[PDB]
Amino acid sequence: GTTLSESFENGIPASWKTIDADGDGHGWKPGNAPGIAGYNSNGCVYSESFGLGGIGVLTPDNYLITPALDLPNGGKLTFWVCAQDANYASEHYAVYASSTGNDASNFTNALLEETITAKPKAIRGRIQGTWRQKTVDLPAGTKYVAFRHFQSTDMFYIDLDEVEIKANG
Ligand SMILES: [Ca+2]
Ligand SMILES: [Ca+2]
């Protein structure tokens, strides 16, 4: 079955689907160095809970969804995530599998759900959040994977990079 490897070095391919479910006009977006460097690479994607330039506080419910997948005996997903700004790091997200369609309502099996945590002597810390790697088992018959930024507000960005799916298959 499917191997998928996406480094986001040239944005979000049209074969991926984005859903701005909350309807504010802000969804998952391409990021690149120097503003928004990827993991060991130039490009990534990001989603905002606060926008620069007067945009202000947001309440995202934003989906980034893979192309269709062929996983008759399941597979393994890995990806990298961080908080863009270590002082505003508490972004919440979940990863879902659908066996059916690729609408928001088809993503109900949360495989992974978490709020990012920032990593007594006074010491200078990183400006940007540390990249962490996540590994998720994908059930047999999974056709789409969704990354959902939601139940988040008034932090900064969540960044996502280097998505790999290996079929068992
Ligand atoms: Ca990248
Ligand atoms: Ca939105």
From Swiss-Prot:
Record-annotated membrane-spanning stretches: none
Top-level division of the source organism's lineage: Bacteria
UniProt binding sites for Ca(2+) 3: 7, 9, 41, 43, 161-162
Post-translational modifications: Proteolytically cleaved into a catalytic subunit and three adhesins. Arg-gingipain is involved in this post-translational processing.
Chain sites annotated for binding Ca(2+) 4: 20, 22, 24, 26, 62
Domain remark from Swiss-Prot or TrEMBL: The isolated adhesin domains have hemolytic activity (in vitro).
Primary role: Cysteine proteinase with a strong preference for substrates with Lys in the P1 position. Hydrolyzes bovine hemoglobin, bovine serum albumin, casein, human placental type I collagen and human IgA and IgG. Disrupts the functions of polymorphonuclear leukocytes. May act as a virulence factor in the development of peridontal disease. Involved in the coaggregation of P.gingivalis with other oral bacteria. Has hemolytic activity; this is mediated by the adhesin domains and does not require the catalytic domain.
Family (UniProt): Belongs to the peptidase C25 family.
The protein's name: Lys-gingipain W83
UniProt lineage: Bacteria, Pseudomonadati, Bacteroidota, Bacteroidia, Bacteroidales
Gene: kgp
Residues of the full protein shown: 982 to 1154 of 1732
